[PDB]
Amino acid sequence: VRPRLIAELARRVRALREQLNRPRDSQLYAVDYETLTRPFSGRRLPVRAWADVRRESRLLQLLGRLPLFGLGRLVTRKSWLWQHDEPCYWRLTRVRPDYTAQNLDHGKAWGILTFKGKTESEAREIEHVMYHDWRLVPKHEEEAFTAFTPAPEDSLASVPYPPLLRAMIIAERQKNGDTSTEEPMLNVQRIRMEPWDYPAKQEDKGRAKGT
Amino acid sequence: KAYRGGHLTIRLALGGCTNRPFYRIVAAHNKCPRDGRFVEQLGSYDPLPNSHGEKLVALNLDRIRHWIGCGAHLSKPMEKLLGLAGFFPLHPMMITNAERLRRKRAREVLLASQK
Amino acid sequence: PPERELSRLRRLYQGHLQEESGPPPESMPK
Amino acid sequence: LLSSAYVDSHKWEAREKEHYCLADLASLMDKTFERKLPVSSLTISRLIDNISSREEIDHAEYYLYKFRHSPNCWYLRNWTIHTWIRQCLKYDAQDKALYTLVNKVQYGIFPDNFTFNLLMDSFIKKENYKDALSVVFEVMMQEAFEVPSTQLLSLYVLFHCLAKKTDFSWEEERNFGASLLLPGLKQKNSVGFSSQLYGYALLGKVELQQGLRAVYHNMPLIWKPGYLDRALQVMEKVAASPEDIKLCREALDVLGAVLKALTSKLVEQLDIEETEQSKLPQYLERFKALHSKLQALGKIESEGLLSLTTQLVKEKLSTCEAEDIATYEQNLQQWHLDLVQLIQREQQQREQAKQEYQA
């Protein structure tokens, strides 16, 4: 096999140039509020976000105005406030501001999540930090905001099998000599249904490539 | 052949001729062509009623269970077919469509009464 | 659905709502 | 209002400082910045320590701006912010301190309560109540009313400014309402409850005329409607309070005027919930019933807000000042320990780097 060294050289050069010409958050997540397009790419935002993009604040637009970038403060989201009645918020632990931003209104954040009153054990990176959806809980309101009484979360423990599959389970049971009259039953206790709007893992998420 | 990512899915591959469709229920890589390479044929579906007024669906249920247990996804028409067979719960969208058709026919009947 | 959830949806979809549908006919209309 | 001992700068001027020329440190920061490399918090600390003139304040402002816009902006130490404010006061540059405070985002000036008090008190001594009010609003924006001294001084300034204000805007309504609610909630006396009532009245007027978003947006305030309801709850709580706690007639008059004037974009509320505009008449009825109840119980104070705040200040500011001075000296000792740790660490890296270089 004739060696293909130009391909390797091109791959290495491209990798080096991408890790030296990384676009910053201030560039990637800037928005033109008049046209609601990203100047970096020119792609228009979805319609259902437009109003929020003109009314709500990004997370670090709030954190840049606070000492220590607001470590330890509670931050909630407008979408959560509208969707859920139970308290949903992040308790900040670490903030990495985008120093290249003029107003330091871009960057990353880490914290502990409480969703619908249920607090997590560990602190993880916060997703949707660049969304215009963030609100800061006032210090004098936190006691009233965080209050939550865990209601009895008693859901169905099991469900019937589908008709044909139940029939096959019963028929096999009778064929094997067992004569039990107990209904075949599907356990759903270990299948916990997560709301579609629960925060996902920001660490596993990708990033827009510079171009 | 190596695809970037992708997964196995149980879906309907279209065969037959013009104005005469027929489907093979196959497990295939989602990136493969509709009527191309597959891993295993898991059944068939004739959508045209026969001389007995029946739509014939063959399902290799042992292999369907095997491939679902091997990590295969399902196309929405296949989920609806399995719901009709009683193998799966009736898909939510079938119920919603049934309710929508009920409401539309009620509106038509009310129009007839109004006239 | 409860009225509170319907109001929440009406707030979420301001200006892009269609007429609210009641319970469907119990049987298939003839 | 603050004694000489509180505002005395001798202990700060007695701190241990490494002497440098600001030109040399400025050049080193300039090189580090053009190389896109991070600058240490120690370097900016040394630069701010060695301000020795009014033009050096102008240069230190620029280098504070560049440190804020650098990778290590988070590491700006509290002693550096305190020293920046001290230098601005020392070289007759309160305007520059105020400029960096209002544009805290661009400069990262987040003072502690002692430093807010120093700046506000300098403005009060020079009878510059407009700038003192600006400092009060900056305290409110940072929610820094944890220390009773700051609460008392802010309330004094706010009532002084309100005594002489008639033509009155809605942004001003919002700012004054927040600045009177936050310190008011922390004071369990007649001043605190009267301030709560007055601020709730102003914020409720803002909510009813301009919308709730005009109230809570970019403010340390909640996004729940019912600010006038909360004013009426203040009145009800006072009706059931001990003998000592009363309510000023002026705050009640302001609430009555707001209600009498009120009763003469996306929807954020659920359509099942009753609006505040549809509750205004019941607010009038409750206000009148509660006003009669409080007048019967003798829980209405006739002294003005400014005078009664003045006596409260004369009664408690001395103790608050003593506590603040004790904490301030503790903070100075801790800052000295941290600074010597930083100096030791950088000396160690320089020595290790030279050892590596000789190989």
PDB file of C-alpha atoms in Angstrom, chain D residues 89-253:
ATOM      1  CA  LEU D  89     -11.561  58.665  48.471  1.00  0.00           C
ATOM      2  CA  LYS D  90      -7.972  59.608  49.346  1.00  0.00           C
ATOM      3  CA  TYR D  91      -7.171  61.433  46.085  1.00  0.00           C
ATOM      4  CA  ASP D  92     -10.530  63.230  45.793  1.00  0.00           C
ATOM      5  CA  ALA D  93     -11.945  60.851  43.190  1.00  0.00           C
ATOM      6  CA  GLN D  94     -15.356  59.833  44.523  1.00  0.00           C
ATOM      7  CA  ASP D  95     -16.767  60.306  41.022  1.00  0.00           C
ATOM      8  CA  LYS D  96     -14.424  57.591  39.739  1.00  0.00           C
ATOM      9  CA  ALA D  97     -15.386  55.219  42.555  1.00  0.00           C
ATOM     10  CA  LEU D  98     -19.050  55.815  41.748  1.00  0.00           C
ATOM     11  CA  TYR D  99     -18.417  55.310  38.026  1.00  0.00           C
ATOM     12  CA  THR D 100     -16.747  51.956  38.647  1.00  0.00           C
ATOM     13  CA  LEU D 101     -19.493  50.985  41.104  1.00  0.00           C
ATOM     14  CA  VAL D 102     -22.408  51.726  38.757  1.00  0.00           C
ATOM     15  CA  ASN D 103     -20.588  49.960  35.908  1.00  0.00           C
ATOM     16  CA  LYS D 104     -19.674  47.096  38.217  1.00  0.00           C
ATOM     17  CA  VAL D 105     -20.068  44.668  35.306  1.00  0.00           C
ATOM     18  CA  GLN D 106     -17.215  46.304  33.372  1.00  0.00           C
ATOM     19  CA  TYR D 107     -14.915  46.759  36.396  1.00  0.00           C
ATOM     20  CA  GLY D 108     -15.915  44.057  38.885  1.00  0.00           C
ATOM     21  CA  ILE D 109     -16.280  46.408  41.871  1.00  0.00           C
ATOM     22  CA  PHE D 110     -18.407  44.519  44.396  1.00  0.00           C
ATOM     23  CA  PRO D 111     -17.747  46.231  47.737  1.00  0.00           C
ATOM     24  CA  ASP D 112     -18.472  44.795  51.146  1.00  0.00           C
ATOM     25  CA  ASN D 113     -20.758  46.629  53.555  1.00  0.00           C
ATOM     26  CA  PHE D 114     -17.940  48.610  55.190  1.00  0.00           C
ATOM     27  CA  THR D 115     -16.860  49.997  51.822  1.00  0.00           C
ATOM     28  CA  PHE D 116     -20.413  50.895  50.782  1.00  0.00           C
ATOM     29  CA  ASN D 117     -20.754  52.712  54.095  1.00  0.00           C
ATOM     30  CA  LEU D 118     -17.487  54.597  53.557  1.00  0.00           C
ATOM     31  CA  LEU D 119     -18.531  55.795  50.099  1.00  0.00           C
ATOM     32  CA  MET D 120     -22.103  56.671  51.095  1.00  0.00           C
ATOM     33  CA  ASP D 121     -20.884  58.544  54.166  1.00  0.00           C
ATOM     34  CA  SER D 122     -18.330  60.545  52.190  1.00  0.00           C
ATOM     35  CA  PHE D 123     -21.153  61.652  49.905  1.00  0.00           C
ATOM     36  CA  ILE D 124     -23.352  62.510  52.901  1.00  0.00           C
ATOM     37  CA  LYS D 125     -20.582  64.575  54.532  1.00  0.00           C
ATOM     38  CA  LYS D 126     -20.198  66.558  51.311  1.00  0.00           C
ATOM     39  CA  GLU D 127     -24.023  66.940  51.269  1.00  0.00           C
ATOM     40  CA  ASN D 128     -24.133  65.182  47.879  1.00  0.00           C
ATOM     41  CA  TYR D 129     -27.372  63.298  48.418  1.00  0.00           C
ATOM     42  CA  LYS D 130     -27.849  62.612  44.699  1.00  0.00           C
ATOM     43  CA  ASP D 131     -24.655  60.544  44.593  1.00  0.00           C
ATOM     44  CA  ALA D 132     -25.460  59.061  48.006  1.00  0.00           C
ATOM     45  CA  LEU D 133     -28.793  57.920  46.564  1.00  0.00           C
ATOM     46  CA  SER D 134     -26.909  56.430  43.613  1.00  0.00           C
ATOM     47  CA  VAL D 135     -24.802  54.463  46.100  1.00  0.00           C
ATOM     48  CA  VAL D 136     -27.988  53.393  47.911  1.00  0.00           C
ATOM     49  CA  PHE D 137     -29.425  52.073  44.651  1.00  0.00           C
ATOM     50  CA  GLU D 138     -26.186  50.210  43.948  1.00  0.00           C
ATOM     51  CA  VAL D 139     -26.457  48.638  47.407  1.00  0.00           C
ATOM     52  CA  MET D 140     -30.023  47.600  46.569  1.00  0.00           C
ATOM     53  CA  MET D 141     -29.003  46.103  43.216  1.00  0.00           C
ATOM     54  CA  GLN D 142     -26.362  43.977  44.969  1.00  0.00           C
ATOM     55  CA  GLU D 143     -28.719  43.016  47.841  1.00  0.00           C
ATOM     56  CA  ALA D 144     -26.149  44.057  50.430  1.00  0.00           C
ATOM     57  CA  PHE D 145     -28.468  44.982  53.316  1.00  0.00           C
ATOM     58  CA  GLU D 146     -27.192  42.210  55.602  1.00  0.00           C
ATOM     59  CA  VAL D 147     -25.490  44.664  58.003  1.00  0.00           C
ATOM     60  CA  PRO D 148     -27.705  46.974  60.123  1.00  0.00           C
ATOM     61  CA  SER D 149     -25.360  49.935  59.564  1.00  0.00           C
ATOM     62  CA  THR D 150     -25.975  49.833  55.810  1.00  0.00           C
ATOM     63  CA  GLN D 151     -29.723  49.464  56.373  1.00  0.00           C
ATOM     64  CA  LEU D 152     -29.885  52.494  58.661  1.00  0.00           C
ATOM     65  CA  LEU D 153     -27.752  54.716  56.424  1.00  0.00           C
ATOM     66  CA  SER D 154     -29.675  53.723  53.293  1.00  0.00           C
ATOM     67  CA  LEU D 155     -33.025  54.391  54.964  1.00  0.00           C
ATOM     68  CA  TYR D 156     -31.823  57.797  56.151  1.00  0.00           C
ATOM     69  CA  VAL D 157     -30.681  58.748  52.645  1.00  0.00           C
ATOM     70  CA  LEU D 158     -33.869  57.449  51.016  1.00  0.00           C
ATOM     71  CA  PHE D 159     -36.210  59.338  53.334  1.00  0.00           C
ATOM     72  CA  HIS D 160     -34.121  62.501  53.018  1.00  0.00           C
ATOM     73  CA  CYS D 161     -34.372  62.307  49.229  1.00  0.00           C
ATOM     74  CA  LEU D 162     -38.094  61.489  49.285  1.00  0.00           C
ATOM     75  CA  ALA D 163     -38.978  64.423  51.540  1.00  0.00           C
ATOM     76  CA  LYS D 164     -38.150  66.795  48.645  1.00  0.00           C
ATOM     77  CA  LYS D 165     -39.424  64.945  45.555  1.00  0.00           C
ATOM     78  CA  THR D 166     -42.718  65.578  43.734  1.00  0.00           C
ATOM     79  CA  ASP D 167     -42.300  64.989  39.972  1.00  0.00           C
ATOM     80  CA  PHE D 168     -41.634  61.316  40.102  1.00  0.00           C
ATOM     81  CA  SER D 169     -41.063  58.709  37.389  1.00  0.00           C
ATOM     82  CA  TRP D 170     -41.841  55.006  37.196  1.00  0.00           C
ATOM     83  CA  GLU D 171     -38.237  53.801  37.053  1.00  0.00           C
ATOM     84  CA  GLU D 172     -37.777  55.970  40.138  1.00  0.00           C
ATOM     85  CA  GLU D 173     -40.858  54.357  41.692  1.00  0.00           C
ATOM     86  CA  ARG D 174     -39.314  50.930  41.124  1.00  0.00           C
ATOM     87  CA  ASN D 175     -35.878  51.873  42.458  1.00  0.00           C
ATOM     88  CA  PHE D 176     -37.205  53.654  45.552  1.00  0.00           C
ATOM     89  CA  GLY D 177     -39.656  50.850  46.284  1.00  0.00           C
ATOM     90  CA  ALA D 178     -36.984  48.159  46.155  1.00  0.00           C
ATOM     91  CA  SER D 179     -34.491  50.282  48.120  1.00  0.00           C
ATOM     92  CA  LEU D 180     -37.069  50.824  50.876  1.00  0.00           C
ATOM     93  CA  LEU D 181     -38.427  47.278  50.940  1.00  0.00           C
ATOM     94  CA  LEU D 182     -35.079  45.508  51.271  1.00  0.00           C
ATOM     95  CA  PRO D 183     -33.774  47.357  54.375  1.00  0.00           C
ATOM     96  CA  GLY D 184     -37.316  47.619  55.722  1.00  0.00           C
ATOM     97  CA  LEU D 185     -37.812  43.855  55.921  1.00  0.00           C
ATOM     98  CA  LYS D 186     -34.716  43.541  58.139  1.00  0.00           C
ATOM     99  CA  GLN D 187     -35.773  46.210  60.681  1.00  0.00           C
ATOM    100  CA  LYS D 188     -38.321  45.021  63.257  1.00  0.00           C
ATOM    101  CA  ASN D 189     -39.405  48.486  64.344  1.00  0.00           C
ATOM    102  CA  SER D 190     -41.658  51.322  63.199  1.00  0.00           C
ATOM    103  CA  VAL D 191     -39.102  52.471  60.618  1.00  0.00           C
ATOM    104  CA  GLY D 192     -38.916  49.003  59.101  1.00  0.00           C
ATOM    105  CA  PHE D 193     -42.658  48.453  58.821  1.00  0.00           C
ATOM    106  CA  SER D 194     -43.313  51.970  57.530  1.00  0.00           C
ATOM    107  CA  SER D 195     -40.579  51.483  54.924  1.00  0.00           C
ATOM    108  CA  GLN D 196     -42.057  48.116  53.947  1.00  0.00           C
ATOM    109  CA  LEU D 197     -45.477  49.700  53.493  1.00  0.00           C
ATOM    110  CA  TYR D 198     -44.180  52.687  51.519  1.00  0.00           C
ATOM    111  CA  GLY D 199     -42.046  50.529  49.232  1.00  0.00           C
ATOM    112  CA  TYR D 200     -44.840  48.035  48.635  1.00  0.00           C
ATOM    113  CA  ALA D 201     -47.120  50.940  47.728  1.00  0.00           C
ATOM    114  CA  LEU D 202     -44.616  52.254  45.184  1.00  0.00           C
ATOM    115  CA  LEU D 203     -43.948  48.812  43.689  1.00  0.00           C
ATOM    116  CA  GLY D 204     -47.680  48.138  43.493  1.00  0.00           C
ATOM    117  CA  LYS D 205     -48.206  51.384  41.617  1.00  0.00           C
ATOM    118  CA  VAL D 206     -45.472  50.295  39.207  1.00  0.00           C
ATOM    119  CA  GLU D 207     -47.095  46.865  38.831  1.00  0.00           C
ATOM    120  CA  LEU D 208     -50.569  48.263  38.165  1.00  0.00           C
ATOM    121  CA  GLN D 209     -49.590  51.032  35.759  1.00  0.00           C
ATOM    122  CA  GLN D 210     -46.598  49.560  33.892  1.00  0.00           C
ATOM    123  CA  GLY D 211     -46.908  45.799  34.484  1.00  0.00           C
ATOM    124  CA  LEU D 212     -45.313  43.262  36.804  1.00  0.00           C
ATOM    125  CA  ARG D 213     -42.334  42.753  34.491  1.00  0.00           C
ATOM    126  CA  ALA D 214     -41.541  46.441  34.941  1.00  0.00           C
ATOM    127  CA  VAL D 215     -41.284  45.604  38.647  1.00  0.00           C
ATOM    128  CA  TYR D 216     -39.246  42.404  38.751  1.00  0.00           C
ATOM    129  CA  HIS D 217     -37.092  42.649  35.611  1.00  0.00           C
ATOM    130  CA  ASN D 218     -33.424  43.259  36.474  1.00  0.00           C
ATOM    131  CA  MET D 219     -34.369  43.853  40.122  1.00  0.00           C
ATOM    132  CA  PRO D 220     -34.001  41.919  43.384  1.00  0.00           C
ATOM    133  CA  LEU D 221     -37.780  41.460  43.489  1.00  0.00           C
ATOM    134  CA  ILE D 222     -40.170  38.548  43.122  1.00  0.00           C
ATOM    135  CA  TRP D 223     -42.218  37.831  39.990  1.00  0.00           C
ATOM    136  CA  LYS D 224     -45.458  37.153  41.906  1.00  0.00           C
ATOM    137  CA  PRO D 225     -48.320  39.683  41.673  1.00  0.00           C
ATOM    138  CA  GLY D 226     -49.919  41.219  44.739  1.00  0.00           C
ATOM    139  CA  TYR D 227     -47.645  44.007  45.964  1.00  0.00           C
ATOM    140  CA  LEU D 228     -50.603  46.097  47.151  1.00  0.00           C
ATOM    141  CA  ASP D 229     -51.931  42.992  48.872  1.00  0.00           C
ATOM    142  CA  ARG D 230     -48.556  42.749  50.616  1.00  0.00           C
ATOM    143  CA  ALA D 231     -48.830  46.378  51.738  1.00  0.00           C
ATOM    144  CA  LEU D 232     -52.215  45.553  53.246  1.00  0.00           C
ATOM    145  CA  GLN D 233     -50.648  42.536  54.960  1.00  0.00           C
ATOM    146  CA  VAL D 234     -48.056  44.875  56.474  1.00  0.00           C
ATOM    147  CA  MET D 235     -50.950  46.913  57.858  1.00  0.00           C
ATOM    148  CA  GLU D 236     -52.639  43.771  59.211  1.00  0.00           C
ATOM    149  CA  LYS D 237     -49.416  42.567  60.841  1.00  0.00           C
ATOM    150  CA  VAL D 238     -48.970  45.959  62.504  1.00  0.00           C
ATOM    151  CA  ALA D 239     -52.548  45.725  63.777  1.00  0.00           C
ATOM    152  CA  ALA D 240     -51.519  42.541  65.639  1.00  0.00           C
ATOM    153  CA  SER D 241     -48.054  43.655  66.836  1.00  0.00           C
ATOM    154  CA  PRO D 242     -46.725  44.664  70.270  1.00  0.00           C
ATOM    155  CA  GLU D 243     -47.357  48.135  71.663  1.00  0.00           C
ATOM    156  CA  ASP D 244     -44.029  49.590  70.532  1.00  0.00           C
ATOM    157  CA  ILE D 245     -44.453  48.890  66.808  1.00  0.00           C
ATOM    158  CA  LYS D 246     -46.551  51.568  65.074  1.00  0.00           C
ATOM    159  CA  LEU D 247     -46.991  52.884  61.523  1.00  0.00           C
ATOM    160  CA  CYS D 248     -46.106  56.331  60.214  1.00  0.00           C
ATOM    161  CA  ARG D 249     -48.982  58.473  58.983  1.00  0.00           C
ATOM    162  CA  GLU D 250     -46.943  59.413  55.896  1.00  0.00           C
ATOM    163  CA  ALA D 251     -46.637  55.835  54.624  1.00  0.00           C
ATOM    164  CA  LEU D 252     -50.374  55.335  55.117  1.00  0.00           C
ATOM    165  CA  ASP D 253     -51.025  58.571  53.233  1.00  0.00           C
TER     166      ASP D 253
END
